[model samples]
Target: MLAKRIIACLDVKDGRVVKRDSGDPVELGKFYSEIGIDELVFLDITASVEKRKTMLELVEKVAEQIDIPFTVGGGIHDFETASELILRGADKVSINTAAVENPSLITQIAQTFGSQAVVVAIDAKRVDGEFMVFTYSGKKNTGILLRDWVVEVEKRGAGEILLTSIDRDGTKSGYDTEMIRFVRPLTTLPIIASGGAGKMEHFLEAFLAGADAALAASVFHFREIDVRELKEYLKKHGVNVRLE
Candidate 1:
């Protein structure tokens, strides 16, 4: 069986790593690294009208400091920008709004850099009893069916799916297991369930629901749960995870 990944997410804004409740990146990184996280994802949550080079600089800084694999997302629209990020030490570049706008971009990135280097981030919100995919930092709706989008991206050769529930983001109540389960069987691509993780039980629920990996911000940033301890707990529960 594939070893399930325990990833720590750092949502950045204005060049500073910020969390919903926690304040800055340094604090968040220190806490996550101390707990021995498997990987880290840094997303610049702000919407920039034009792509900026500062995002690459952020990746450089993060790669220099963090020992684990670092994945970056936000404001990547073209192949050049995506390639620049990967060259800057990002293990993978996650595209959401851009991919939604131009679905072929996923295939282009995969062709130029290999499928493993591309991760398509799907930001969806439950609206009126249906999950709607959103873009531009979850400010605008794509009006596309969630399942259709996932299957389309997978068919386009996206390496992985970073599925984020905007409605559950920062809520810490738990994840939308039904949402993950609903999308799981639609495609064979690995899905990293994001948003709405409050405790270790939530992580277990996500895995049981069919997510290949689970991601969270507030719980890890606030030091509410340690990744090492979480992995140990998951191991006890019979979930496959890498441990140090």
Candidate 2:
């Protein structure tokens, strides 16, 4: 079995890290790498051309410093954008709004870079007992059922699923294990449980729920949890995490 991973998520806007902009993103990426984080993900909220240019520069800087797998996403709609990031240093490119708008983009990227380089980020929320897919930073409800999209993305050659709970995000309550459980068996692609990560035990819950990785932004950004300490705790609890 592959070892479960703990991924640190950084949300960057205007070329600065959100919540932790007080701290520089490139520095933090190196810090996490030195401390044993399994991977790093940068979600750049790039809007204008200038923002996109700055983000690409940041990706190169961070990629040069960290040895773990790196993923960058936000407003990635075309093959050129995805290919640009990969060439610049992102190990994989994640997509959400663009993927929903054109599902073929998933196949296009996967075909060009191979499936291992494609990660489909699905923002979902449970409403009236049904899980629905959301897009545009969770502002728009696509009305697509979660299960259907999960299977479809996998069929389209997505290597992994970054399943984030819109309702539980930034709540620090815990992961939406119920949602994880619901989607765990739908496809064989690795699932990265995101959002609602507060306590170290929350990561444990996600792994137990069949998530291949647990990703968080606030807990790590706020210094509420140390990546190495969290891994130690998880290892003690019987989760397979890299400790070196």
> Best-fitting candidate, measured by TM-score?
2
Q: Highest lDDT: which candidate?
A: 2
lDDT of each: 0.84, 0.89
| Candidate 1 lDDT score at position 109 | 87
Q: Write down the TM-score of every candidate.
A: 0.90, 0.96
In model 1, where do residues sit more than 4 Å from their true spots? 20-31, 45-51
- Could you give candidate 2's per-residue lDDT for residues 1-244 as a string of tens digits? 5899999998888767888354778888888888888899998876767866887898798788777788998788788989888989889999998998899999999998899999999999988899999998998989999989999999999999999999899798899999999999999999999999989999999999999999988788778899888989999999898988
Q: Write the per-residue lDDT of candidate 1 for residues 1-244, one digit (tens) a residue.
A: 7988888888787767775445656456655776768778887766574335667777777778766677888778888889889888888999999999999999988998888989999999888888889988898988998978999999999999999999888788898898999999999998999989988999999999999988887787677888888999999999999877
Give the range where candidate 1 is weakest over 10 consecutive residues by summed lDDT.
19-28
Quick one: how many clashes does candidate 2 have? 0
Worst 10 residues of 2 by lDDT: 14-23
Let me know the TM-score candidate 1 reaches against the reference structure: 0.90
